[PDB]
PDB file of C-alpha atoms and ligand atoms in Angstrom:
ATOM      1  CA  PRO A   1      15.801 -21.045  15.658  1.00 42.60           C
ATOM      2  CA  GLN A   2      12.534 -22.298  17.853  1.00 43.99           C
ATOM      3  CA  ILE A   3      10.515 -19.905  19.628  1.00 44.92           C
ATOM      4  CA  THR A   4       7.329 -20.147  21.882  1.00 46.48           C
ATOM      5  CA  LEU A   5       4.337 -17.974  21.337  1.00 44.36           C
ATOM      6  CA  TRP A   6       4.127 -16.033  24.476  1.00 42.15           C
ATOM      7  CA  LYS A   7       4.601 -12.503  22.430  1.00 41.62           C
ATOM      8  CA  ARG A   8       3.805 -12.057  18.889  1.00 39.10           C
ATOM      9  CA  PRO A   9       6.569 -13.765  16.202  1.00 39.08           C
ATOM     10  CA  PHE A  10       8.372 -10.954  14.881  1.00 41.58           C
ATOM     11  CA  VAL A  11      11.478 -11.547  12.466  1.00 43.96           C
ATOM     12  CA  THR A  12      13.670  -8.936  11.359  1.00 43.35           C
ATOM     13  CA  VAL A  13      13.714  -9.002   7.427  1.00 45.66           C
ATOM     14  CA  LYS A  14      15.294  -7.737   4.417  1.00 46.03           C
ATOM     15  CA  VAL A  15      13.091  -7.503   1.644  1.00 45.52           C
ATOM     16  CA  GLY A  16      14.487  -6.139  -2.045  1.00 41.29           C
ATOM     17  CA  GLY A  17      17.031  -4.104  -0.232  1.00 43.65           C
ATOM     18  CA  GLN A  18      14.751  -2.416   2.715  1.00 44.56           C
ATOM     19  CA  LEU A  19      14.415  -3.611   6.180  1.00 46.61           C
ATOM     20  CA  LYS A  20      11.404  -4.516   7.827  1.00 47.56           C
ATOM     21  CA  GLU A  21       9.899  -6.328  10.989  1.00 45.31           C
ATOM     22  CA  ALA A  22       7.533  -8.961   9.953  1.00 44.44           C
ATOM     23  CA  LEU A  23       4.787 -11.205  11.914  1.00 44.63           C
ATOM     24  CA  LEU A  24       5.823 -15.259  11.142  1.00 43.98           C
ATOM     25  CA  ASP A  25       1.973 -16.060  10.548  1.00 43.62           C
ATOM     26  CA  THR A  26       0.751 -19.322  10.020  1.00 44.56           C
ATOM     27  CA  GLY A  27      -2.696 -18.085   9.244  1.00 43.97           C
ATOM     28  CA  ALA A  28      -1.435 -16.230   5.941  1.00 40.76           C
ATOM     29  CA  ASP A  29      -0.854 -17.659   2.954  1.00 41.24           C
ATOM     30  CA  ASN A  30       0.565 -14.775   1.041  1.00 40.71           C
ATOM     31  CA  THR A  31       3.594 -12.539   2.612  1.00 41.83           C
ATOM     32  CA  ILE A  32       2.306  -9.082   2.467  1.00 42.75           C
ATOM     33  CA  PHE A  33       4.241  -5.961   3.120  1.00 41.49           C
ATOM     34  CA  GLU A  34       3.421  -1.981   3.628  1.00 39.79           C
ATOM     35  CA  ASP A  35       5.593   0.660   2.715  1.00 39.11           C
ATOM     36  CA  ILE A  36       8.354  -0.832   0.501  1.00 39.40           C
ATOM     37  CA  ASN A  37       9.378  -0.313  -2.951  1.00 36.23           C
ATOM     38  CA  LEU A  38      10.177  -2.409  -5.245  1.00 36.01           C
ATOM     39  CA  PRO A  39      10.768  -2.497  -9.164  1.00 37.12           C
ATOM     40  CA  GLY A  40       9.423  -3.369 -12.425  1.00 34.56           C
ATOM     41  CA  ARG A  41       6.137  -4.985 -13.366  1.00 33.32           C
ATOM     42  CA  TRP A  42       3.348  -5.742 -10.952  1.00 32.27           C
ATOM     43  CA  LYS A  43       0.086  -7.603 -11.249  1.00 29.83           C
ATOM     44  CA  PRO A  44      -3.192  -6.161  -9.024  1.00 31.57           C
ATOM     45  CA  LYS A  45      -4.930  -8.439  -6.286  1.00 33.35           C
ATOM     46  CA  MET A  46      -6.856  -8.510  -3.427  1.00 33.74           C
ATOM     47  CA  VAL A  47      -6.480 -10.280   0.229  1.00 32.38           C
ATOM     48  CA  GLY A  48      -9.040 -11.084   2.704  1.00 32.34           C
ATOM     49  CA  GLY A  49      -9.167 -11.108   6.516  1.00 35.08           C
ATOM     50  CA  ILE A  50     -11.341 -10.613   9.779  1.00 33.16           C
ATOM     51  CA  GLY A  51     -13.274  -7.696   8.605  1.00 30.44           C
ATOM     52  CA  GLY A  52     -12.584  -6.982   5.003  1.00 31.65           C
ATOM     53  CA  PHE A  53     -10.364  -7.199   1.735  1.00 31.92           C
ATOM     54  CA  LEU A  54      -7.399  -5.480   0.708  1.00 32.61           C
ATOM     55  CA  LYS A  55      -6.012  -4.147  -2.552  1.00 34.49           C
ATOM     56  CA  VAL A  56      -2.446  -5.286  -3.064  1.00 36.73           C
ATOM     57  CA  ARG A  57       0.221  -5.016  -5.973  1.00 35.56           C
ATOM     58  CA  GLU A  58       1.851  -8.379  -6.397  1.00 37.24           C
ATOM     59  CA  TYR A  59       5.624  -8.533  -7.012  1.00 35.29           C
ATOM     60  CA  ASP A  60       7.008 -12.081  -8.364  1.00 36.49           C
ATOM     61  CA  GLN A  61      11.106 -11.655  -8.451  1.00 34.81           C
ATOM     62  CA  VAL A  62      11.801  -9.734  -4.825  1.00 31.81           C
ATOM     63  CA  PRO A  63      14.679 -10.812  -2.626  1.00 33.29           C
ATOM     64  CA  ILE A  64      13.995 -11.947   0.962  1.00 33.32           C
ATOM     65  CA  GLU A  65      16.465 -12.572   3.590  1.00 32.92           C
ATOM     66  CA  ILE A  66      15.193 -14.339   6.543  1.00 33.19           C
ATOM     67  CA  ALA A  67      16.751 -16.260   9.059  1.00 30.21           C
ATOM     68  CA  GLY A  68      19.648 -16.792   7.544  1.00 32.11           C
ATOM     69  CA  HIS A  69      18.384 -17.755   4.256  1.00 30.93           C
ATOM     70  CA  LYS A  70      17.915 -15.991   0.969  1.00 32.62           C
ATOM     71  CA  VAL A  71      14.901 -17.074  -1.273  1.00 31.24           C
ATOM     72  CA  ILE A  72      12.971 -15.501  -3.828  1.00 29.33           C
ATOM     73  CA  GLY A  73       9.291 -15.139  -3.079  1.00 25.60           C
ATOM     74  CA  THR A  74       6.129 -13.516  -4.146  1.00 25.94           C
ATOM     75  CA  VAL A  75       5.665 -10.461  -2.307  1.00 22.58           C
ATOM     76  CA  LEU A  76       2.343  -8.493  -2.141  1.00 21.52           C
ATOM     77  CA  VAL A  77       2.833  -5.145  -1.395  1.00 22.50           C
ATOM     78  CA  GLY A  78      -0.231  -3.157   0.626  1.00 24.53           C
ATOM     79  CA  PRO A  79      -1.516  -0.989   3.248  1.00 25.80           C
ATOM     80  CA  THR A  80      -1.279  -4.012   6.066  1.00 25.79           C
ATOM     81  CA  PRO A  81      -1.680  -3.049   9.344  1.00 25.57           C
ATOM     82  CA  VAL A  82       1.558  -5.186  10.079  1.00 28.18           C
ATOM     83  CA  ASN A  83       4.115  -6.916   7.809  1.00 28.05           C
ATOM     84  CA  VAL A  84       3.417 -10.885   7.507  1.00 27.21           C
ATOM     85  CA  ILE A  85       5.330 -13.684   6.061  1.00 28.72           C
ATOM     86  CA  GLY A  86       3.160 -16.140   5.302  1.00 31.00           C
ATOM     87  CA  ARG A  87       3.297 -19.615   4.084  1.00 30.03           C
ATOM     88  CA  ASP A  88       4.536 -19.279   0.708  1.00 30.01           C
ATOM     89  CA  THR A  89       7.913 -17.720   2.313  1.00 32.08           C
ATOM     90  CA  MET A  90       8.173 -19.972   5.109  1.00 33.47           C
ATOM     91  CA  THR A  91       7.792 -23.323   3.161  1.00 34.17           C
ATOM     92  CA  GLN A  92      10.714 -22.217   1.412  1.00 38.04           C
ATOM     93  CA  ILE A  93      12.832 -22.050   4.847  1.00 37.00           C
ATOM     94  CA  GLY A  94      10.966 -25.420   5.946  1.00 37.69           C
ATOM     95  CA  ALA A  95       9.315 -23.648   8.953  1.00 43.46           C
ATOM     96  CA  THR A  96       7.318 -26.263  11.120  1.00 42.28           C
ATOM     97  CA  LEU A  97       4.601 -26.111  13.933  1.00 40.77           C
ATOM     98  CA  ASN A  98       4.976 -28.195  16.992  1.00 39.13           C
ATOM     99  CA  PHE A  99       2.066 -28.588  19.009  1.00 40.86           C
TER     100      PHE A  99
ATOM    101  CA  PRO B   1       2.383 -33.247  15.916  1.00 40.29           C
ATOM    102  CA  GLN B   2       4.769 -31.600  14.203  1.00 41.71           C
ATOM    103  CA  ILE B   3       3.409 -30.088  10.647  1.00 44.24           C
ATOM    104  CA  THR B   4       4.787 -28.354   7.754  1.00 43.46           C
ATOM    105  CA  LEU B   5       3.236 -25.213   6.474  1.00 46.21           C
ATOM    106  CA  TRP B   6       2.550 -26.809   2.435  1.00 43.87           C
ATOM    107  CA  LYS B   7      -1.247 -26.815   3.322  1.00 44.17           C
ATOM    108  CA  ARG B   8      -3.778 -24.553   5.632  1.00 47.03           C
ATOM    109  CA  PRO B   9      -2.700 -25.681   9.453  1.00 49.16           C
ATOM    110  CA  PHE B  10      -6.413 -26.754   9.905  1.00 48.30           C
ATOM    111  CA  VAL B  11      -7.016 -28.714  13.342  1.00 49.91           C
ATOM    112  CA  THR B  12      -9.982 -30.173  14.715  1.00 48.80           C
ATOM    113  CA  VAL B  13     -11.528 -29.041  17.694  1.00 50.48           C
ATOM    114  CA  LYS B  14     -14.175 -29.199  19.941  1.00 52.83           C
ATOM    115  CA  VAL B  15     -15.286 -25.897  21.656  1.00 54.17           C
ATOM    116  CA  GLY B  16     -18.387 -25.545  23.700  1.00 56.11           C
ATOM    117  CA  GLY B  17     -19.240 -28.840  22.822  1.00 51.91           C
ATOM    118  CA  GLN B  18     -19.357 -28.242  19.135  1.00 52.80           C
ATOM    119  CA  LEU B  19     -17.128 -29.258  16.911  1.00 52.82           C
ATOM    120  CA  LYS B  20     -15.296 -27.077  14.166  1.00 53.20           C
ATOM    121  CA  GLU B  21     -11.970 -26.702  12.301  1.00 51.21           C
ATOM    122  CA  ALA B  22      -9.634 -23.895  12.831  1.00 52.20           C
ATOM    123  CA  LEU B  23      -6.570 -22.341  11.344  1.00 54.60           C
ATOM    124  CA  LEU B  24      -3.283 -22.859  13.800  1.00 54.43           C
ATOM    125  CA  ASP B  25      -2.679 -18.960  13.207  1.00 54.05           C
ATOM    126  CA  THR B  26       0.729 -17.910  15.077  1.00 55.13           C
ATOM    127  CA  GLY B  27      -0.387 -14.321  13.782  1.00 55.57           C
ATOM    128  CA  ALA B  28      -3.643 -14.107  15.951  1.00 52.99           C
ATOM    129  CA  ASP B  29      -3.604 -12.907  19.350  1.00 55.45           C
ATOM    130  CA  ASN B  30      -6.854 -14.318  19.948  1.00 50.08           C
ATOM    131  CA  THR B  31      -9.021 -17.387  19.040  1.00 50.01           C
ATOM    132  CA  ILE B  32     -12.265 -16.718  17.098  1.00 52.29           C
ATOM    133  CA  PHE B  33     -15.159 -18.682  16.538  1.00 47.17           C
ATOM    134  CA  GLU B  34     -18.389 -18.131  14.221  1.00 50.20           C
ATOM    135  CA  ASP B  35     -21.591 -19.846  14.288  1.00 45.67           C
ATOM    136  CA  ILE B  36     -21.113 -20.935  17.952  1.00 50.15           C
ATOM    137  CA  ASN B  37     -23.083 -20.685  20.421  1.00 51.22           C
ATOM    138  CA  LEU B  38     -21.749 -20.402  24.034  1.00 50.90           C
ATOM    139  CA  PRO B  39     -23.984 -19.996  27.342  1.00 46.35           C
ATOM    140  CA  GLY B  40     -23.912 -17.250  30.371  1.00 45.79           C
ATOM    141  CA  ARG B  41     -22.566 -13.310  30.015  1.00 44.66           C
ATOM    142  CA  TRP B  42     -20.731 -11.846  27.146  1.00 45.87           C
ATOM    143  CA  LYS B  43     -18.380  -8.677  26.896  1.00 46.46           C
ATOM    144  CA  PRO B  44     -18.261  -6.616  23.570  1.00 44.73           C
ATOM    145  CA  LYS B  45     -15.106  -6.141  21.222  1.00 44.13           C
ATOM    146  CA  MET B  46     -13.600  -5.487  17.524  1.00 39.95           C
ATOM    147  CA  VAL B  47     -10.313  -7.203  16.355  1.00 40.56           C
ATOM    148  CA  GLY B  48      -8.828  -5.976  13.338  1.00 36.57           C
ATOM    149  CA  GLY B  49      -6.814  -7.657  10.261  1.00 31.67           C
ATOM    150  CA  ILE B  50      -6.124  -7.189   6.590  1.00 30.96           C
ATOM    151  CA  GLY B  51      -9.132  -5.044   5.971  1.00 28.27           C
ATOM    152  CA  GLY B  52     -10.078  -3.887   9.460  1.00 25.53           C
ATOM    153  CA  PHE B  53     -12.000  -4.323  11.996  1.00 27.85           C
ATOM    154  CA  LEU B  54     -14.608  -7.872  12.708  1.00 23.83           C
ATOM    155  CA  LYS B  55     -17.329  -7.370  15.384  1.00 26.60           C
ATOM    156  CA  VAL B  56     -16.919 -10.071  17.969  1.00 27.96           C
ATOM    157  CA  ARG B  57     -18.698 -11.061  21.428  1.00 27.77           C
ATOM    158  CA  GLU B  58     -15.947 -12.455  23.953  1.00 24.60           C
ATOM    159  CA  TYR B  59     -16.542 -15.119  26.542  1.00 27.65           C
ATOM    160  CA  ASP B  60     -13.745 -15.950  29.246  1.00 28.06           C
ATOM    161  CA  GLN B  61     -14.888 -20.026  30.141  1.00 32.87           C
ATOM    162  CA  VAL B  62     -15.609 -22.089  27.548  1.00 31.64           C
ATOM    163  CA  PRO B  63     -14.273 -25.614  27.087  1.00 31.30           C
ATOM    164  CA  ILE B  64     -11.596 -25.975  24.173  1.00 34.12           C
ATOM    165  CA  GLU B  65     -10.159 -29.327  23.165  1.00 32.04           C
ATOM    166  CA  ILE B  66      -7.647 -29.291  21.035  1.00 31.97           C
ATOM    167  CA  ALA B  67      -4.673 -31.607  20.364  1.00 36.65           C
ATOM    168  CA  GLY B  68      -5.490 -33.877  22.594  1.00 33.75           C
ATOM    169  CA  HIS B  69      -5.342 -31.146  25.703  1.00 35.15           C
ATOM    170  CA  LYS B  70      -8.611 -29.686  27.198  1.00 38.12           C
ATOM    171  CA  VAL B  71      -7.645 -25.576  27.665  1.00 37.74           C
ATOM    172  CA  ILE B  72     -10.005 -23.616  29.337  1.00 35.81           C
ATOM    173  CA  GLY B  73      -9.416 -20.037  27.015  1.00 33.96           C
ATOM    174  CA  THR B  74     -11.329 -16.951  26.068  1.00 33.16           C
ATOM    175  CA  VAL B  75     -12.774 -17.037  22.773  1.00 34.81           C
ATOM    176  CA  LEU B  76     -13.916 -14.663  20.791  1.00 35.30           C
ATOM    177  CA  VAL B  77     -17.396 -15.409  18.442  1.00 33.39           C
ATOM    178  CA  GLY B  78     -17.783 -13.477  15.113  1.00 28.63           C
ATOM    179  CA  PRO B  79     -18.096 -13.648  11.483  1.00 26.78           C
ATOM    180  CA  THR B  80     -14.397 -14.605  10.540  1.00 27.06           C
ATOM    181  CA  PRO B  81     -13.992 -16.003   7.291  1.00 26.18           C
ATOM    182  CA  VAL B  82     -12.404 -18.895   9.011  1.00 24.62           C
ATOM    183  CA  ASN B  83     -12.120 -19.725  12.679  1.00 25.41           C
ATOM    184  CA  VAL B  84      -8.546 -19.524  13.857  1.00 23.56           C
ATOM    185  CA  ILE B  85      -6.479 -20.566  17.156  1.00 23.15           C
ATOM    186  CA  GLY B  86      -4.444 -17.772  17.903  1.00 28.46           C
ATOM    187  CA  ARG B  87      -1.625 -17.604  20.355  1.00 31.75           C
ATOM    188  CA  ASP B  88      -3.818 -16.900  23.930  1.00 29.45           C
ATOM    189  CA  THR B  89      -4.698 -20.841  23.024  1.00 36.13           C
ATOM    190  CA  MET B  90      -1.212 -22.378  21.551  1.00 36.60           C
ATOM    191  CA  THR B  91       0.565 -20.771  24.279  1.00 37.51           C
ATOM    192  CA  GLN B  92      -1.372 -22.911  26.439  1.00 35.32           C
ATOM    193  CA  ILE B  93      -0.542 -26.473  24.642  1.00 37.96           C
ATOM    194  CA  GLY B  94       3.238 -25.168  24.174  1.00 42.54           C
ATOM    195  CA  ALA B  95       3.031 -25.048  20.806  1.00 42.16           C
ATOM    196  CA  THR B  96       6.440 -23.612  19.180  1.00 41.90           C
ATOM    197  CA  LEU B  97       7.585 -22.100  15.818  1.00 43.22           C
ATOM    198  CA  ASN B  98      10.706 -23.615  13.950  1.00 44.08           C
ATOM    199  CA  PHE B  99      12.369 -21.916  11.557  1.00 40.90           C
TER     200      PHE B  99
HETATM  201  C1  LIG C   1      -3.194 -10.195   9.519  1.00 42.16           C
HETATM  202  C2  LIG C   1      -2.777 -10.472  11.182  1.00 42.16           C
HETATM  203  C3  LIG C   1      -2.184  -9.808  11.303  1.00 42.16           C
HETATM  204  C4  LIG C   1      -4.364 -10.880  11.487  1.00 42.16           C
HETATM  205  N1  LIG C   1      -5.144 -11.712  11.417  1.00 42.16           N
HETATM  206  C5  LIG C   1      -4.792 -13.687  11.167  1.00 42.16           C
HETATM  207  C6  LIG C   1      -4.159 -13.606  10.133  1.00 42.16           C
HETATM  208  O1  LIG C   1      -3.344 -14.975  10.073  1.00 42.16           O
HETATM  209  C7  LIG C   1      -5.362 -13.927   9.136  1.00 42.16           C
HETATM  210  C8  LIG C   1      -6.181 -15.361   9.388  1.00 42.16           C
HETATM  211  C9  LIG C   1      -7.294 -15.579   8.245  1.00 42.16           C
HETATM  212  C10 LIG C   1      -7.274 -16.317   7.459  1.00 42.16           C
HETATM  213  C11 LIG C   1      -8.455 -16.835   6.451  1.00 42.16           C
HETATM  214  C12 LIG C   1      -9.300 -16.015   6.067  1.00 42.16           C
HETATM  215  C13 LIG C   1      -9.175 -14.924   7.034  1.00 42.16           C
HETATM  216  C14 LIG C   1      -8.245 -14.774   8.236  1.00 42.16           C
HETATM  217  N2  LIG C   1      -4.400 -14.366   7.528  1.00 42.16           N
HETATM  218  C15 LIG C   1      -4.946 -13.373   6.779  1.00 42.16           C
HETATM  219  O2  LIG C   1      -5.271 -12.181   7.214  1.00 42.16           O
HETATM  220  O3  LIG C   1      -4.236 -14.138   5.501  1.00 42.16           O
HETATM  221  C16 LIG C   1      -4.270 -13.621   4.044  1.00 42.16           C
HETATM  222  C17 LIG C   1      -2.895 -13.352   3.929  1.00 42.16           C
HETATM  223  O4  LIG C   1      -3.174 -14.246   2.892  1.00 42.16           O
HETATM  224  C18 LIG C   1      -4.005 -14.699   2.605  1.00 42.16           C
HETATM  225  O5  LIG C   1      -4.523 -16.041   3.447  1.00 42.16           O
HETATM  226  C19 LIG C   1      -5.332 -16.295   4.495  1.00 42.16           C
HETATM  227  C20 LIG C   1      -6.227 -14.837   3.939  1.00 42.16           C
HETATM  228  F1  LIG C   1      -6.978 -14.604   5.212  1.00 42.16           F
HETATM  229  F2  LIG C   1      -7.108 -14.638   2.695  1.00 42.16           F
HETATM  230  C21 LIG C   1      -5.244 -13.868   3.207  1.00 42.16           C
HETATM  231  S1  LIG C   1      -6.868 -11.656  11.457  1.00 42.16           S
HETATM  232  O6  LIG C   1      -7.091 -13.038  11.346  1.00 42.16           O
HETATM  233  O7  LIG C   1      -6.722 -10.333  11.244  1.00 42.16           O
HETATM  234  C22 LIG C   1      -6.769 -11.982  13.232  1.00 42.16           C
HETATM  235  C23 LIG C   1      -6.818 -10.696  13.761  1.00 42.16           C
HETATM  236  C24 LIG C   1      -7.066 -11.015  15.628  1.00 42.16           C
HETATM  237  C25 LIG C   1      -7.385 -11.891  15.878  1.00 42.16           C
HETATM  238  N3  LIG C   1      -7.464 -12.356  17.559  1.00 42.16           N
HETATM  239  C26 LIG C   1      -7.558 -13.433  15.623  1.00 42.16           C
HETATM  240  C27 LIG C   1      -7.371 -12.960  13.802  1.00 42.16           C
HETATM  241 CL1  LIG C   2       3.855  -9.076  21.839  1.00 39.93          CL
HETATM  242 CL1  LIG C   3       0.902   4.481   3.242  1.00 35.62          CL
HETATM  243 CL1  LIG C   4      -4.684 -25.817   2.265  1.00 36.66          CL
HETATM  244 CL1  LIG C   5       0.802 -31.413   3.483  1.00 40.30          CL
HETATM  245 NA1  LIG C   6       7.658 -16.079  -0.570  1.00 42.00          NA
HETATM  246  Y1  LIG C   7       2.155   3.455   5.421  1.00 44.22           Y
HETATM  247  Y1  LIG C   8     -22.183 -17.693   9.716  1.00 45.04           Y
END
């Protein structure tokens, strides 16, 4: 699709089998979800933004169905206020900004 | 321009006469800069992200030269780790996401 930016750019995804809404976020390097359960080993990490770093777990497998594509991506899991789709995932689906 | 997302989407702007680099950030509701000085009255605020709330001043005049356009927009000033151009400014220049 092509969208304007008058509303927050949410999309519906399925991540590790769970349905979620997440913000298409060109300012996020890294996709992050809260409140999902994923199997297997993880590696610990932190992400930094406006007003603080957060603690996350990293998963490297994890399926992500987004905008009619299925990619395999890195997903960070931790208590973000909204779920975001970052550039790691958006580049896999060929997303572009026009301005 | 049309850009892909393989790198952080920085643009060069002139905000209140000062040259800055800022991230085109579709996950940001409003534009924020650090280390700019702007004239006139302001109003207090906080924004929230990964990690919690950055404290800011809001200015309502403030000229912003971006991508060959000159907007007048709202600008928040506070200690963000990277300057961001949010949807408030991006909508005024007609920016779109393609995915
Ligand atoms: C989280 C999102 C819903 C809100 N934020 C915008 C983001 O685009 C932010 C913009 C941002 C970029 C760079 C530093 C701080 C914030 N990026 C961000 O938090 O990304 C994190 C996840 O991937 C990593 O890549 C950048 C990172 F931060 F490190 C990590 S924000 O910065 O908190 C923000 C909130 C409100 C306004 N008005 C403006 C900005
Ligand atoms: Cl909205
Ligand atoms: Cl929780
Ligand atoms: Cl980069
Ligand atoms: Cl590039
Ligand atoms: Na990904
Ligand atoms: Y939760
Ligand atoms: Y500073």
